């Protein structure tokens, strides 16, 4: 048993390992989307930059969880990072919708992890989730929601003009 481990339940440790894998998976999804919009027959550079930045973000979430694992004396156990469900993301609207869905899966997972910390009386872990992840998930979900709303309002995915202008005026600054 680790010399630092204190009040860190094995269930919390396993849940943290699974959450690490999930964050890495999300990072992979965003990488895929970004270079999908980098394609010469899609050519939405701001969608590309947006989803690449999100990918690096997920990388940071994962690495922070691995840091937490070491801090509490748990042991990191990595699993295969599954490839995303799609190779072709269709359009900017569809990519935003898949990102909203993914983000709500990740959020649900973090809510279950926080409930686990609460039931196991792990206030440090619950506060870690609260402080570093819960509000970031809420903000990401709201932002994706606004993007979906505006793209649909503009006429996506039917309007390539719509996705072009959204790429320029919304994701371009």
Q: Which of Zn ion, ligand BYX, a copy of itself, none binds 61 (CB below 5-8 Å, type-dependent)?
A: Zn ion
Distance CA 71, CA 69 (A): 5
Q: Per the annotation, does 118 bind a ligand?
A: no
Smallest distance from a copy of itself to CB 95, Å: 14
Q: Does 115 bind ligand BYX (CB under 6 A)?
A: no
- Measuring CA to CA, which residue among 107, 147, 145 is closest to residue 129? 107
**Least Å from the CB of residue 15 to ligand BYX:** 15
CB of 54 to a copy of itself, least distance (A): 14
The size of the interface with Zn ion (CB under 5 A), counted in residues, is 6
What Å distances lie between residue 92 and 28, 43, 123, CA to CA? 17, 11, 40
Decide which of a copy of itself, ligand BYX, Zn ion, none touches 64; Cβ closer than 5 to 8 Å per partner kind: none
Is residue 13 within 8 Å of residue 73, measured between CB atoms?
Answer: no
C-alpha span between 4 and 7 (Å, rounded):
10
Binding interface with ligand BYX (CB under 6 A): 118-119
């Amino acid at each position: 048993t680790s010399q630092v481990r204190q009040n860190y339940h094995q269930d919390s440790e396993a849940a943290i390992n699974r959450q690490i894998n999930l964050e890495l998976y999300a990072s992979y999804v965003y990488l895929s989307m970004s270079y999908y919009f980098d394609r010469d027959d899609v050519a939405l550079k701001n969608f590309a930059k947006y989803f690449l930045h999100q990918s690096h973000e997920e990388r940071e979430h994962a690495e922070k969880l691995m840091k937490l694992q070491n801090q509490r004396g748990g042991r990191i156990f990595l699993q295969d990072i599954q490839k995303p469900d799609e190779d072709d993301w269709e359009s900017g609207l569809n990519a935003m919708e898949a990102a909203l869905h993914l983000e709500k899966n990740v959020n649900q997972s973090l809510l279950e992890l926080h409930k686990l910390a609460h039931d196991k009386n792990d206030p440090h872990l619950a506060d870690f989730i609260e402080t570093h992840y819960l509000n970031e998930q809420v903000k990401a979900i709201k932002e994706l929601g606004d993007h979906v709303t505006n793209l649909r309002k503009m006429g996506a995915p039917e309007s390539g003009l719509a996705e072009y202008l959204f790429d320029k005026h919304t994701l371009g600054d």
